[PDB]
Design a protein around this ligand. Sequence first.
Ligand SMILES: O=C(O)CNC(=O)C(=O)O
Ligand SMILES: [Mg+2]
Ligand code: NI
Ligand SMILES: [Zn+2]
Length: 331
Amino acid sequence: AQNPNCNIMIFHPTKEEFNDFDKYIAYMESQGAHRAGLAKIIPPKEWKARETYDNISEILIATPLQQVASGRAGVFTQYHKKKKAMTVGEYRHLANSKKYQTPPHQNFEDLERKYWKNRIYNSPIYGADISGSLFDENTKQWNLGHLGTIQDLLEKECGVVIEGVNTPYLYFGMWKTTFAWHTEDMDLYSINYLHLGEPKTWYVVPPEHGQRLERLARELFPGSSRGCGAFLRHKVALISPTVLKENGIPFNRITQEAGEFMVTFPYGYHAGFNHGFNCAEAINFATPRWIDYGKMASQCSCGEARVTFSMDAFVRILQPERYDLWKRGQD
Ligand SMILES: O=C(O)CNC(=O)C(=O)O
Ligand SMILES: [Mg+2]
Ligand code: NI
Ligand SMILES: [Zn+2]
């Protein structure tokens, strides 16, 4: 078996290999990339997402989210407090202010130490889940707004047409902005392009060891676990690498820089933080290999998680038994 230690693999496709997205994902998995839960794809030098980022300041962040932490340095939850709308221009200025700016540091490792030491004592503001795209319409390769839809994949594989659409989201980040431990909705894949700015550091657990993370999570967030059998679907729980090591949870870490893609694989738990002002674009996608993961995916039915319109159909077709109880959590 390829990549038996579940290392995060880095790919350097040629511009020829960059034409066919599906085929390259399949290629990565033939080399065992999926065993890590996460991969890095460096685009060919010929490729550009768009000409410049000089004209993005007028994008509105309708609902910036202030990420307030509770708990201990290495084991904490976060909640999102809604703040007033601001433009990307205003957000960038806020990100660079003394209160919110990245501190002096030697290297990514030093910044990572500072993140886990001090994250809980601040509440950075995140522009997350903003519907939209920064890919030029003429960017033909790996354009996150032009991927085959999950609905079309489900139909190709299972013979059934379903409602739903699948569009990208933009994330404007600053120092310490944080994404909690999670898999994707319906344990889908995700792909994330870091368009501009400062890096994003990621942690990931191999899909074959996901349940180990879940078991640790139930022990570390015992109240949350009693409230919901899939409370990580709430995307609020953080566990540091030091704590994962102490508990023998297998994982890996890697820093994504501007101009690089990351792909998360089905049931690959991940979490991470941003190093300073940045902009990423992301979207879920599916392959034939996803179907079995979709069929087995845990669901939140306590009602916290509350998800996209499009997910109804996935649960309805793939998890008909769960569909009655799940949709009650949606309404
Ligand atoms: O960029 C972020 O904050 C979160 N992104 C993801 O979890 C993803 O792309 O799968
Ligand atoms: Mg603009
Ligand atoms: Ni994700
Ligand atoms: Zn729940």
